[PDB]
Amino acid sequence: QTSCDQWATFTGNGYTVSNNLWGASAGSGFGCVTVVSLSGGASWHADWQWSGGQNNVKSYQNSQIAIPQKRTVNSISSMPTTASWSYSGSNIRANVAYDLFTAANPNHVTYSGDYELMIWLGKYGDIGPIGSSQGTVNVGGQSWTLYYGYNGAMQVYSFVAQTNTTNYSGDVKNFFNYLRDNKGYNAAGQYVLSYQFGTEPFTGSGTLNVASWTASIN
Numbered sequence: 001q002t003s004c005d006q007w008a009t010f011t012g013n014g015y016t017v018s019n020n021l022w023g024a025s026a027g028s029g030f031g032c033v034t035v036v037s038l039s040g041g042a043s044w045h046a047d048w049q050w051s052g053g054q055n056n057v058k059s060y061q062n063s064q065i066a067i068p069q070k071r072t073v074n075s076i077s078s079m080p081t082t083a084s085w086s087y088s089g090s091n092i093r094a095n096v097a098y099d100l101f102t103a104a105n106p107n108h109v110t111y112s113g114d115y116e117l118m119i120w121l122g123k124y125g126d127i128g129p130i131g132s133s134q135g136t137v138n139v140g141g142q143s144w145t146l147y148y149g150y151n152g153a154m155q156v157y158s159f160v161a162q163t164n165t166t167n168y169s170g171d172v173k174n175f176f177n178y179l180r181d182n183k184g185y186n187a188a189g190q191y192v193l194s195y196q197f198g199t200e201p202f203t204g205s206g207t208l209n210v211a212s213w214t215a216s217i218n
């Protein structure tokens with residue numbers, strides 16, 4: 001189904017698609033999500049138009065999976081995911097990105113974390129991640145520009161693809177392992193609180209078509 005309501009959510013089979021227009025107060029416009037299928041992953045599209053607040057994210061329309069029991073990053077053996085998407089519209093300033101929070105407390109509120117891991121498969125316009133570039137890194141055989149900085153007390157690592165990656169197959173465990181093995185990230189003590197995929201728009205008119213998104217934690 002389709003909804004443009006600010007906080008619309010749709011759930012099925014452990015997947016949830018949310019409108020999540022948390023930054024609407026930064027501009028004029030709208031955001032709508034359409035669920036096509038929640039069987040065999042999430043197939044959905046995000047539609048939006050935004051003006052004003054040049055450097056303010058307006059929303060993070062996203063699909064995510066339920067995480068009934070929080071586990072440490074090291075205890076998890078695999079976090080496989082696939083994504084097939086395309087972006088259309090005009091004057092698109094927006095990204096396409098995975099978002100995950102972790103925290104030392106497994107009972108941490110799930111709307112923030114000690115750390116935020118982002119994996120930007122797409123980047124439209126002159127926008128950029130939190131922090132500064134730490135250079136090019138290899139994860140899963142693909143090159144990423146890794147950014148690191150703080151959003152308040154929370155530390156944010158964003159792996160940004162060097163080309164829009166519209167068909168992706170990977171394992172988020174490889175990204176956490178990169179941090180654990182190269183940036184002192186405490187995978188032994190951090191629990192995965194969320195596992196999301198969507199788009200952060202700033203301005204323009206856009207449609208993100210997510211033909212398929214799958215993710216699980218094993």
Ligand SMILES: *[C@@H]1O[C@H](CO)[C@@H](O)[C@H](O)[C@H]1NC(C)=O
Pocket residue numbers: 122123124125161162163164
């Ligand atoms: C994604 O595509 C847009 C539109 O062609 C382009 O401007 C942008 O540089 C691309 N981003 C990446 C990461 O290649």
